[PDB]
Structure formats: structure tokens, C-alpha cells
């Protein structure tokens, strides 16, 4: 075997690269852009649909729409188009040679996994492949075996507690609040300042704004009171047009939804309370240890200052006799990819691949008898 491939088909971005490395070979938004103008420019070979970074470059005229909704793929055609683009542009290796690795959200409707493995075996001829939950990869990223992973990304967020050796499936919690919902709420509250964003390209612009100028408040009412004098919370942004945008308390109001889901009218408990309930569902033999290790991973958890509030609030909920630490790796965005690469690099993993030889006589349902 030459090499191995890891492709974390996230809701918003795709991080595809060879195994055995810490730097992804190609990371780019998972957007398929189709122009909305019949006025074709004759010549110079413009193609019907645009994917990857070209979509971001030409978003001025296309209609960007993600092919994943809350971790569930719903436009398999554009999914396979994205995979085609990856394999034969950003990797330049045929899938017939190098086996791949995929990532799936926990508690995902398994029709998604079945169709995924079926379509890969059909139209990509991969020698072998595997599907693993992002939580185990996140745990493997730090090299340890204890803790509960707070993996929040673009589509959904989930917590999977795990001790040495075996996990605890009954304690897995999943919430749909994620970066897409944060961007939507930020767009909703931006119109209160007179700035209106409606198009999908405007959604990307607001997402960039959220990337650059957002943070989590240590104490919500204290910062709201501080917002009485617009001194420090007030910042500025430069639009691609050349405009100037003035942003106020919306800098920290939109990340608060992770802890107060009622802001966007979703009946639920904030991620801190979700983690507390998930750990409480575990037995006394295990939470005494799981309190100390709390793995934070994903693009959404990259917010500056979110870790401090997470820590303070989790110790507020937990008994005062507990010592709680929050793990804050400086490479949390690619943490799932690094965990997958580490898992693939181990020589003790070649045994439980999913080869075509066993797939042919077992059908697409084999993905359930092998992975989990």
C-alpha cells in the first residue's frame, strides 16, 4: 500500500489530506456554487457549477448552498461532485489505490452512512475505508484515553464521555446549535443596526465577520451593563465593497447562544448544562475522573475566552469540592483530522478496514457489523 487518505466531510469545511501528517494537505469550504445568470459569456471555458475555493472567489454571482444540513447530507449529487473535486484536483491521486477514512456524527441517521459507503464503493473504487465518530479521534488527538469531548463545528455539536478502553454510548448528547446557527443569529441581530445582509455571499461575509470580531462574555449581565458606555466593545470592520461596519454588543451576544439557546427560540439547555447532564448520567466510578479532563475541539470552540466561561460555569454547576480543567489545544480546528491521522498511522489498524472482498458478499449493511 502506498499511503492513506483522511477526509473529514464536515458540515461547512472539508479537511482532506494524507495520513501520518499534522498539517492538512487541503482545507477549503464545502460549497457548491451554481451561477444565477443565463447571460453566458461565450468563450474562456466557464463551467456550469463551481466548488471549493473557486466558489468563494466567485460568490459575487453564484448561489452558495451547503450540501450538509445539521450533519446529514441531503444533496448526494453535490456531495459526490465535491469528492470528485477533492480527489482529482487537491489530491491528484486516484481513489483506486489509496484507502480512505471518513468521519460521521454520533446518532446520525444510518441511512446516511449506508449511502455514503455504497456510493464510495460504487463510483470511487477505494480499496478499503472506515467510518469513525469525531469524538474518538478528538480523544486520540491529545494521546490520552479519559475525558468528554466537546466537539462543536458547523452543523451540530456533541459530547461523548469516555474512560480507558470503552465508551459510554448511553451518555452521548448531541445538539444542533453550531456555527451556522451562530451566523444566522448574527445576521438576524445585525439588522437592528441598519446593516442588512440577505444573499448567500452576504452570509459568507457575516461568517467572516464572526470569525474576526466575536468573543464570549465572562458574565452576560455584567457585560450588558458595561455596554452602557460604548468604549471597548465597539469595533469596526472593512467590507469588501469598501464600506465600514460598526459593531457593538452583537460581538458577544451571538456566541452566548451556546449557553442560552432560548435566544434563538430553541428549547434546550446550554452546552454547559448539556455537558453537566451527560457527565451526571455516568456512574460514580467514572465521573470523579472525567471531571478533570474536558476535551474541547471543533471550529466553533475556537472562540477567544469561551474556555474561561466554560470552566467557571462547569465548576458553578459541579460540587465545590471538584477540580475541573478545560483542555484548550492551540490546534483545535484540525484536531479531528490529527486524531484520524494518528489512528491511521498505527500499524494495529490494518486489520479492521472494510475491504471490497468482504463487502461484495455482505452488501452495504456490512458498515454496521464492522464499524460499530
Amino acid at each position: 500500500e502506498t499511503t492513506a487518505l483522511v477526509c473529514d466531510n464536515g458540515s461547512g469545511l472539508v479537511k482532506a489530506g494524507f495520513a501520518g501528517d499534522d498539517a492538512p494537505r487541503a482545507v477549503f469550504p464545502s460549497i457548491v456554487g451554481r451561477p444565477r445568470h443565463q447571460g453566458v459569456m461565450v468563450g474562456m471555458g466557464q463551467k456550469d457549477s463551481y466548488v471549493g475555493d473557486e466558489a468563494q472567489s466567485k460568490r459575487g454571482i453564484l448561489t452558495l448552498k451547503y450540501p450538509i444540513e445539521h450533519g446529514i447530507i441531503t444533496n448526494w449529487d453535490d456531495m459526490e461532485k465535491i469528492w470528485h473535486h477533492t480527489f482529482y484536483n487537491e489530491l491528484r491521486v486516484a481513489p483506486e489505490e489509496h484507502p480512505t477514512l471518513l468521519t460521521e456524527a454520533p446518532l446520525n441517521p444510518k441511512a446516511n452512512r449506508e449511502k455514503m459507503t455504497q456510493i464510495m464503493f460504487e463510483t470511487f473504487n477505494v480499496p478499503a475505508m472506515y467510518v469513525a465518530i469525531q469524538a474518538v479521534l478528538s480523544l486520540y488527538a491529545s494521546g490520552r484515553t479519559t475525558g468528554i469531548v466537546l466537539d462543536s463545528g458547523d452543523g451540530v455539536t456533541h459530547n461523548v464521555p469516555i474512560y480507558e478502553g470503552y465508551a459510554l454510548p448511553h451518555a452521548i448528547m448531541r445538539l444542533d446549535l453550531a456555527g451556522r446557527d451562530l451566523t444566522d443569529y448574527l445576521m438576524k441581530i445585525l439588522t437592528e443596526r441598519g446593516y442588512s445582509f440577505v444573499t448567500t455571499a452576504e452570509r459568507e461575509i457575516v461568517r467572516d465577520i464572526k470569525e474576526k470580531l466575536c468573543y464570549v462574555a465572562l458574565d452576560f449581565e455584567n457585560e450588558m451593563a458595561t455596554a452602557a458606555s460604548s468604549s471597548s466593545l465597539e469595533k469596526s470592520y472593512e467590507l469588501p465593497d469598501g464600506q465600514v461596519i460598526t459593531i457593538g454588543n452583537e460581538r458577544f451576544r451571538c456566541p452566548e447562544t451556546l449557553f442560552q439557546p432560548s435566544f434563538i427560540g430553541m428549547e434546550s439547555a446550554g452546552i454547559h448544562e448539556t455537558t453537566y447532564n451527560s457527565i451526571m448520567k455516568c456512574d460514580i466510578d467514572i465521573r470523579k475522573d472525567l471531571y478533570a479532563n474536558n476535551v474541547m475541539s471543533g471550529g466553533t470552540t475556537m472562540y477567544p475566552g469561551i474556555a474561561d466561561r466554560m470552566q467557571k460555569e462547569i465548576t458553578a454547576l459541579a460540587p465545590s469540592t471538584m477540580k475541573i480543567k478545560i483542555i484548550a489545544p492551540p490546534e483545535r480546528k484540525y484536531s479531528v483530522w490529527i486524531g484520524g491521522s494518528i489512528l491511521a498511522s498505527l500499524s494495529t489498524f490494518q486489520q479492521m478496514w472494510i475491504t471490497k472482498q468482504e463487502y461484495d458478499e455482505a452488501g452495504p449493511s456490512i458498515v454496521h457489523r464492522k464499524c460499530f
Partner: protein, 387 residues
């Protein structure tokens, strides 16, 4: 005596009192400055410094018209101050200090606009009460219904709000940035197709009246393309108030098509029916019938001929295509009923008039002058903590 109610819409201004049924006075929200161009300019009576309202729209030939409100918000405020002065001082000619006024405002406006409008209403007039309400709840009041989703389409902006059993779902309020003004602009472009040019200011109101009288919403796209492609029956003759006649063809059914296909006016947002379907589908599974069972049209822009039928057919079709995935077995098990009351144009005013005496006789429900001056702009929170 009775509290006053004001509905300062983008394209029109309506005003009245409680217990009223029809708007006491309606007039375009226009401000006319004097101007001399290549016309005959007969000296009918006189041209004053600033002419607004009915006199402005009548003498519009000799004056230029500027719209203070655009996209549901006030662009230039001095002209709008002149508008309130006109309305209070000659339209009703009753300007006491201390009376109660109930204002209106589309849902997702900027905070500054509402705040400084309330500040102007307090300081410059001295009224003893104020209340600003969404047009959607007033439209709901108009028919007396309690549960159901109401859509309001006006001159400035079209918005929809779902309400279930006296509870407003503030997180699912709609805002579609296509309205009658965009339709009028598209009509002007579609007339520029043939050769007619309307670059003056009075021509804007002329083509607005043209779209009022002639334009209609299609019910079947392919059928109307066939009609306009093979038959000349769709041709209408319209004579301008200047006295000149023009020919209008496919423009009749292509003007209000921008509401259902906003890509015609270069809008990425989904059409009216698609946006309604998404708004209803995003709600909880329990209230979905009552969202579908009671859809109430409101506003002037909803008065398009053949609009309710197209909306009902399109929402049923889109439900069939999106949920059933082409299976026609469960189609007859769907109940959708679009309300088409004759006065859905003044539903906002009717709801405001009802709310005027619904919550009267108790000043401790809204904001007073003293409370305003001693709690600043932040005092304007008793109205509603909407998102």
C-alpha cells in the same frame, strides 16, 4: 378625547381614532418642493414653500416629490417631521398636548429609527402616551383571529409573522425585501423595453397608478406565456393623465411576478410562497395545521388580482413537491385556507384602532412623558422585548 392612532406606512399615511372602522384620511407620504421645468405651469391657485399630502399629489406636475421613507425606514427626517405636522395640523387640525398615540413599525427595523421617532413624538409634540406595535399583530386583530400566520405586503417591505394562540413567535418573524416599490421599478423597466421612458418624478406616481389599474398576478406561467405568445387579447390601452396612450402587453402579468420570483429584480431571497413555506415549516410540529389552516393576507400590495388563488395553489404544490416527494396519495389530506378579506389593505389601521381602546383607560400599560424623560431612550422597553 379618544386616543389617536397613526400608521406611517412607506407609501401612504393613515390616521384616525379608536372605534373607527375605515381610515379617516389616507394620503401618500410625499413632500413636494417647487420646481420649474419644460411644462405650461398654469397658476391654479398658488405654490407654497413646502407642499405635502393631497395638495402635493394634486399639484405634482409643478413640484418634485421626495419620499421620506424607503424600505420601511425613514431616510431623511425633516421631511417626515413636515409630514407629521401636516397630518396633525390640517388633515385632522386637532393638535392637543397629552393625547395618546399608537404608532406602527415593521418588525426588524433599526433601533435608532424607532428610538428617535419616539423621541421626536415626545419632545416636539408633547403627547402624554405612546405605543409602537408591529403591523402583523394589528392585521391579526383586524379579523379578530387569535391563532394563525399573517402576511403583510406594503409599498416599502413585505413581512410575515406567525402567531399561535395569543403567543407571537418572535424568533420566526419574516422579512422579505421585495414590495410594491420594487414592482413599480420593474414595471418602469419593462415599459422601457418597448420605448416609453418615465424619468420624471410625477411619472413614478403615474406608473404606480398604471400598475394599480392594469397589472395582475398570473395563475399559470406557461398558460400566460402561451397567451402572450400567440394571442393579442392581453393587450390593454392606458391613457396617461397627461393624455398620451401607450401599449401594454406581457408587462401586465410580468410586473407582479417579481414577488414570486425575486430573481427578476436581482434578489437572492426566495419567492413569496417559498418563504411562507419555509417560515411555516421551521415552526414546531404541533402548530403546523393552525399555521397552514389560517393564512391571512394583509396590506395594499396583496390586492393583486388573482393573488390568493395563486398563493394557495402554489403552497399546496410546493407542499406536494417538498414533503410527499411526488407521491399523490396523501395530497387530499391537506388543509390550507388563505384569507382574502376585502379590507386587507387597511388591516393595519383596523388593528391599531381596535388596540387603541383594547388597552385604553390605563396609562400604566405604556410610556408617559415623565417616564420617558427620566429613563432616557432605554425607557422604550415596556412596549415589547422583540428580537
Amino acid at each position: 378625547s379618544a386616543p389617536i392612532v397613526l400608521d406611517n406606512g412607506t407609501g401612504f399615511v393613515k390616521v384616525g381614532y379608536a372605534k373607527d372602522n375605515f381610515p379617516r384620511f389616507q394620503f401618500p407620504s410625499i413632500v413636494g418642493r417647487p420646481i420649474l421645468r419644460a411644462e405650461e405651469k398654469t397658476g391654479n391657485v398658488q405654490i407654497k414653500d413646502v407642499m405635502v399630502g393631497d395638495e402635493a399629489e394634486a399639484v405634482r406636475s409643478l413640484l418634485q416629490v421626495k419620499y421620506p421613507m424607503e424600505n420601511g425606514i425613514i431616510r431623511d427626517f425633516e421631511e417626515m417631521n413636515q409630514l407629521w405636522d401636516y397630518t396633525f395640523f390640517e388633515k385632522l387640525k386637532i393638535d392637543p398636548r397629552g393625547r395618546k398615540i399608537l404608532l406602527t413599525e415593521p418588525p426588524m427595523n433599526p433601533v435608532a429609527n424607532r428610538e428617535k421617532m419616539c423621541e421626536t413624538m415626545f419632545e416636539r409634540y408633547g403627547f402624554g402616551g405612546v405605543y409602537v406595535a408591529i403591523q402583523a399583530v394589528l392585521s391579526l386583530y383586524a379579523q379578530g383571529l387569535s391563532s394563525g400566520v399573517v402576511v403583510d405586503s406594503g409599498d416599502g417591505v413585505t413581512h410575515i409573522v406567525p402567531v399561535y394562540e395569543s403567543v407571537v413567535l418572535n424568533h420566526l418573524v419574516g422579512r422579505l425585501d421585495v414590495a410594491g416599490r420594487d414592482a413599480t421599478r420593474y414595471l418602469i423597466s419593462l415599459l422601457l423595453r418597448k420605448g416609453y421612458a418615465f424619468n420624471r418624478t410625477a411619472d413614478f406616481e403615474t406608473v404606480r397608478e398604471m400598475k394599480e389599474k392594469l397589472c395582475y398576478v398570473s395563475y399559470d406561467l406557461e398558460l400566460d406565456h402561451k397567451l402572450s405568445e400567440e394571442t393579442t387579447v392581453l393587450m390593454r390601452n392606458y391613457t396617461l393623465p397627461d393624455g398620451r396612450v401607450i401599449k401594454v402587453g406581457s408587462e401586465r402579468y410580468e410586473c407582479p411576478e417579481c414577488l414570486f420570483q425575486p430573481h427578476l429584480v436581482g434578489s437572492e431571497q426566495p419567492g413569496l410562497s417559498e418563504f411562507i413555506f419555509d417560515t411555516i415549516q421551521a415552526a414546531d410540529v404541533d402548530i403546523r395545521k393552525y399555521l397552514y389552516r389560517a393564512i391571512v393576507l394583509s396590506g395594499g400590495s396583496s390586492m393583486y388580482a388573482g393573488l390568493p388563488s395563486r398563493l394557495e395553489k402554489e403552497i399546496k404544490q410546493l407542499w406536494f413537491e417538498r414533503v410527499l416527494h411526488g407521491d399523490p396519495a396523501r395530497l387530499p389530506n391537506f388543509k390550507v385556507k388563505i384569507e382574502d378579506a376585502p379590507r386587507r389593505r387597511h388591516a393595519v389601521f383596523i388593528g391599531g384602532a381596535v388596540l387603541a381602546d383594547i388597552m385604553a383607560q390605563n396609562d400604566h400599560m405604556w410610556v408617559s412623558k415623565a417616564e420617558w424623560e427620566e429613563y432616557g431612550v432605554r425607557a422604550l422597553d415596556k412596549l415589547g422585548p422583540r428580537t
